[PDB]
Design an enzyme around this catalytic site. Sequence first.
Site, short mmCIF file in Angstrom:
data_model
loop_
_atom_site.label_atom_id
_atom_site.label_comp_id
_atom_site.label_asym_id
_atom_site.label_seq_id
_atom_site.Cartn_x
_atom_site.Cartn_y
_atom_site.Cartn_z
N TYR A 17 -0.51 -9.06 -2.86
CA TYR A 17 0.20 -7.94 -2.30
C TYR A 17 1.70 -7.92 -2.48
CZ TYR A 17 -4.32 -6.46 -0.28
OH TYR A 17 -5.60 -6.02 -0.11
N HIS B 167 -1.71 -6.91 5.65
CA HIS B 167 -2.83 -6.90 6.57
C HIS B 167 -2.51 -7.47 7.91
CE1 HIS B 167 -5.81 -6.53 3.02
NE2 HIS B 167 -5.06 -5.45 3.21
N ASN C 120 0.84 -1.22 0.00
CA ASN C 120 0.00 0.00 0.00
C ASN C 120 0.87 1.26 0.00
OD1 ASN C 120 -2.52 -1.36 -0.03
ND2 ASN C 120 -2.39 -1.60 2.20
C1 LIG Z 1 -3.56 -7.19 -3.81
C2 LIG Z 1 -5.08 -7.03 -3.81
O1 LIG Z 1 -5.81 -8.01 -3.57
N1 LIG Z 1 -5.50 -5.78 -4.03
C3 LIG Z 1 -6.91 -5.46 -4.24
C4 LIG Z 1 -6.97 -5.14 -5.77
O2 LIG Z 1 -6.56 -6.12 -6.68
C5 LIG Z 1 -5.34 -5.81 -7.26
O3 LIG Z 1 -5.65 -4.88 -8.31
C6 LIG Z 1 -4.58 -4.54 -9.06
C7 LIG Z 1 -4.69 -3.18 -9.75
O4 LIG Z 1 -3.71 -2.75 -10.42
O5 LIG Z 1 -5.82 -2.63 -9.65
C8 LIG Z 1 -3.45 -5.36 -9.20
C9 LIG Z 1 -3.35 -6.71 -8.46
O6 LIG Z 1 -3.03 -7.72 -9.39
C10 LIG Z 1 -4.71 -7.07 -7.91
O7 LIG Z 1 -4.56 -8.15 -7.02
C11 LIG Z 1 -8.37 -4.85 -6.19
O8 LIG Z 1 -9.34 -5.93 -5.92
S1 LIG Z 1 -10.01 -6.50 -7.14
O9 LIG Z 1 -10.97 -5.55 -7.73
O10 LIG Z 1 -9.01 -6.88 -8.24
O11 LIG Z 1 -10.76 -7.61 -6.63
C12 LIG Z 1 -8.78 -3.59 -5.41
C13 LIG Z 1 -10.02 -3.07 -6.27
O12 LIG Z 1 -10.90 -3.05 -5.29
O13 LIG Z 1 -8.83 -3.85 -3.97
C14 LIG Z 1 -7.46 -4.24 -3.46
O14 LIG Z 1 -7.45 -4.43 -2.06
#
Ligand SMILES: CC(=O)N[C@@H]1[C@@H](O[C@@H]2OC(C(=O)O)=C[C@H](O)[C@H]2O)[C@@H](OS(=O)(=O)O)[C@@H](CO)O[C@H]1O
Length: 742
Positions: A230, A221, A171
Amino acid sequence: ADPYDALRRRWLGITLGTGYDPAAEPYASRLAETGERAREHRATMAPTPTSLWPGHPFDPPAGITFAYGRLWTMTEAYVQEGTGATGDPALLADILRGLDHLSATVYHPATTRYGNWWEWQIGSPRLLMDITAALYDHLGADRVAAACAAVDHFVPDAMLGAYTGTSTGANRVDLCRSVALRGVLGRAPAKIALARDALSPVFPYVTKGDGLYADGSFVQHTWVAYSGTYGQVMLDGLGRLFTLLAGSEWEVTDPGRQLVLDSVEHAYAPLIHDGLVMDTVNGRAISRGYLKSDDLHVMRSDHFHGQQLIAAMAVLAGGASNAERERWHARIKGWIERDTVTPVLTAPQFPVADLTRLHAIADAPGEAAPEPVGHHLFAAMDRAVHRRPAFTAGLAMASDRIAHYECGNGENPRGWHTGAGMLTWWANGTRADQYTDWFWPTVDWYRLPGTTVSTKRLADRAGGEWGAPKPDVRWVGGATDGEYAAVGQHLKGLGSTLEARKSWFFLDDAVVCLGAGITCADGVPVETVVDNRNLGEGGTQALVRGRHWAHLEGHGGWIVPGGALRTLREDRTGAWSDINTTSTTERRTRRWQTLWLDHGTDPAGADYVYTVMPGASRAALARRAADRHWLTVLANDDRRQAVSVPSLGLTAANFWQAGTAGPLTTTAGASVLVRRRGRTATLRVSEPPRTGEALEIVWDHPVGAVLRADETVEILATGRRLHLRVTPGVVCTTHECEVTLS
Ligand SMILES: CC(=O)N[C@@H]1[C@@H](O[C@@H]2OC(C(=O)O)=C[C@H](O)[C@H]2O)[C@@H](OS(=O)(=O)O)[C@@H](CO)O[C@H]1O
Ligand SMILES: [Mg+2]
C-alpha cells in the site's frame, strides 16, 4: 481542447515511456514479449454473457479487471513500436470488440456492484482509462463517453468526499487516478479539479489510522503496518499524478505535497535492503508468490515489492528538487548495484516506461550510495529496522494499535505470529534472498524467527481478517539514539492465553534478546524461536554447536545455552496455493534449520536470554559466548528488562512499570537508553504505554552540567546523580538530554 490533449499526451509519456530506442536491449525484448502475449490474448478472446476469456468469469469481479488487463497488453502491442503488431488493424478491431463486450455485459451503469469493491473502483477503471487514453483517436466519441459514464457510475464524486473507509491513503490516491483521467479524457475540468483537491488529505502526518506518521511509519487498513505494498501504491499514484498535472491548470499546489517527498528517505528508504522491501511491512502480500492471474508469471516477494517501490521513487524524483533527486538517485544506484537476487534493470514486471526511468538513473553521473549504518524505530507501526556493517534486521511487533497480521481475500491465512516479536535479518554482503526463495510457502508458521508462541494449533484466519486481531496491550515501542536501541513488546499471543515480555537491544554487531513473564494456560508447550532459517533447496551449510553457542555457515550465529537449545534440520515442501487461494499450486522443497527453546507446558513466568549475531564468523561467536564481561543482564523479569554493554558505554532498559534496573530508575513504564562517550553522556527516554503522563528518570552517575535537553525534559537535579522529569507525549517519541560527567 489543447489543455486536455496536452494532459493526455503527458499521461501517455508517463505510461508508455519516452526517449528510448525500441531497438536497444532491454526495451527490444520487453516489447517483443508484449507483442507475443498480445497475439495469444487476441487468439483466445471469447466473448460470452459472463466472461471475456475462458476460465475468467465476471463473477468474481476480478474476472472483469483480468479482462481489462489483457486488453491493456493488446493496447500496448498496438501502440508501441517493436512489438511485431504495432498499428495492426486486426489487433485494433479485437481490442474494440473486447471493450464493447465489457461495456455491454458488465462494466456499465445498469450493474449493481457485487464482490470486491476494489475491482470496480480501482482495478478495472484505471485500466479502462489507460486503454481509452492510448486509443483515444480510434475509439470515437460514444466509446469515450461510455467509458467516462462507467467511471462516473462506479466512482462517483462522493467517493472523493469524506476521507474515510475505502477512500484513504493508497485507496484515495487510486480513486483520484481514475477520476483525474476521466476528467482529462471526457474534457470535464471539474473532475480534474476534484481529483487534485481530493489528494490533499493524503499528505498530512497522522497520529492514528491510515497514512504517513511523523516517525516515518505507514499504516493502511487502520491497523496494519503497510509501507511496502500500500505505501508503494500511494507513492506510485502520487508521483504519476504530480507529474501528470505539473504545469497545468490542475497542478498540485498543496504545500503538504513536500511531506510525500520527505517520506522517500524518512519512511520508505530505511525498509529497503539491497532491492527488497522488508516483508514485515508487506502485510498479506507476503503470501502471493506466483499468482494464478498473472500472465507474466513473476514471483511476488520482498524483492518484487522493493523493485516496485524503487520504480515509484523513480517517477516521484522527476518532480523533486535537485538535491532530493540527487540523493534518491544515489540510493537507487546503490539498490541497483547490490540487488543480485532480481536485477532491477531487467526486472521482468517492468514495462518499458519504468525500464527507461531506471536506466536513466543508472547511466546518470554520481556514485552509488550504501545503506547508512543506523537504527530506525517506526514506533507508530510497531516496526524497527537496524543496520550495522555486518547485517540488516527488521523486527515486527503488534499492539492495541497494530494488528498481529492481516488475512483477507484468501491470502495469508496462517500469518498469526508474524507480529509476535518476529526478527528477520540478512548477513550484509551476501545474497539477500533469505525470505525471497520460497520461504513463506515452506515455512512452519508456528516457528517464525524471534517469536514466542503457544504451540496450540490455530484455525486458518484465526482472530479475523483485515487486521481485526490486535493484542490487548499498551507497552510496545522502544527508545533509540538513531544508532542503537532498546525495543520491547508486551506480548499476548494470538488465539492463546500466552502472555510474555520480549525485549531486543540492538547493538554494534549483535541483537540481545530477553524474554520474561512467559505464562500460558493452553495445556500445551510454549516455544521461543531462537531462529528459523531457510537454507535453500538441498542446503548443506554446516551447523556447528558449542557449549553456549551455535553457528550456521553463511548466515551467522546465536549465543544460547547449548543444552537448552533444540534444533532441527528438515526438508519442507509447499506451494503458494497453500497460503493464498489466488496463487499457483506448484510445490517446491526448501531445507530449513530451525532453533528453539522449549518453555514446557503451562509455564508460569518462564524466561530466556539469547544473543543473535547475524553475519558473524564461528570464531567471533565462540569468543563472545565465552566472554563474561561484554554483556551484563541487569534485570530480566516481568517488571523490567535491562542490559549493560561496557564496550559501547551503554545502558538500556525497558521498564514494564515503575522500578529500577542497575543505575536507572523510573516512576512509570518507559524505555531508556544511556550512552557514555568520554566525559559526556546522552540519556534517551520514551514512554511506550503512551499515557502521556509525566514521569521521572534517575540515572545514578555523577553529572556536572547539562549541555542540552529537549523542551519536554525538565532537569530536577544534577550532582551525585541525574534526575529528570519528562513530558513524554503519546506517540512514543524519544526525548533526549546530554550532560557533562563527573
Ligand atoms: C496493495 C495491495 O495489496 N493491493 C491489492 C492488489 O495488489 C496490488 O495490485 C496492483 C495493481 O496495480 O493492480 C499493484 C500492487 O503492486 C499490488 O500489491 C490486488 O491484489 S492481488 O490480485 O495483486 O493479489 C487487488 C486485486 O485484487 O486487491 C488489492 O487489495
Ligand atoms: Mg561490552
